[PDB]
Amino acid sequence: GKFSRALKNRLESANYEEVELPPPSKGVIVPVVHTVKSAPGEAFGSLAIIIPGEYPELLDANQQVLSHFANDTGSVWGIGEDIPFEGDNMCYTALPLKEIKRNGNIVVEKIFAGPIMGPSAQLGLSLLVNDIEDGVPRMVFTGEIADDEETIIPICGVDIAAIAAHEQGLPLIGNQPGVDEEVRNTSLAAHLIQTGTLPVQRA
Numbered sequence: 379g380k381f382s383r384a385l386k387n388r389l390e391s392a393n394y395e396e397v398e399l400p401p402p403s404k405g406v407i408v409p410v411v412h413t414v415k416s417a418p419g420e421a422f423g424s425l426a427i428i429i430p431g432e433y434p435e436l437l438d439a440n441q442q443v444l445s446h447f448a449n450d451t452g453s454v455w456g457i458g459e460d461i462p463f464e465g466d467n468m469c470y471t472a473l474p475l476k477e478i479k480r481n482g483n484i485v486v487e488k489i490f491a492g493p494i495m496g497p498s499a500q501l502g503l504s505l506l507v508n509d510i511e512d513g514v515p516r517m518v519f520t521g522e523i524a525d526d527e528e529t530i531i532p533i534c535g536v537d538i539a540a541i542a543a544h545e546q547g548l549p550l551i552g553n554q555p556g557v558d559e560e561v562r563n564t565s566l567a568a569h570l571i572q573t574g575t576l577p578v579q580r581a
Contacts, residue, residue: 381538382420389414389422392490393474397436401482402429405514407475407548408502409539410494421535423542425518426494427475427484428454428506430468437473438488445493452507458493461500463527466507472499478514478546497522498533501552501567509568516574517559518543519567520552528563 389412405427413421434442434455445457452465456472472494477485501521520539522531533539536556543550549558551567559576561567570576 386422396487405429406506423538
């Protein structure tokens with residue numbers, strides 16, 4: 379459960395083959411919690427960017443798995459479970475995001491670990507295939523999407539994910555306390571991408 383700087387440094391010491399890529403045509407950022415059975419009760423966070431195209435070769439071989447959106451409608455390299463909603467008939471890769479730059483260039487690297495498990499990348503993925511057209515929103519999304527494709531189900535480890543977002547100067551977005559801007563549902567998340575920041579009230 380708890381944030382461990384010691385786990386972070388020991389696992390991240392093995393990160394390798396850093397590379398800089400041009401700006402994605404679009405993308406979305408999500409947080410990942412890292413654990414290992416022999417470090418019980420410890421965890422730390424990182425960010426992943428999900429971009430168009432097939433780049434299994436940029437991933438550690440243990441992440442070179444392909445998971446599919448529902449029915450015919452596209453797939454993502456690097457994620458470990460199927461996605462219960464339709465995509466937009468595009469192929470994506472989920473890459474460890476080391477840095478996203480001023481000019482949009484992304485710095486990606488390999489990590490020694492399995493693929494991205496669990497349902498908390500679903501808010502991101504849903505926004506990516508339904509609402510994002512161009513660019514990468516400068517924010518980090520976290521949450522499971524219900525059957526209605528509107529309700530956002532909250533995650534454990536929101537503190538870990540926050541740390542991970544803040545490291546890179548980005549806000550955490552989700553439907554729970556601990557996040558920087560709360561979004562009750564997917565369509566409020568999509569409105570946030572449009573406004574870019576939370577609207578302000580002055581009386």
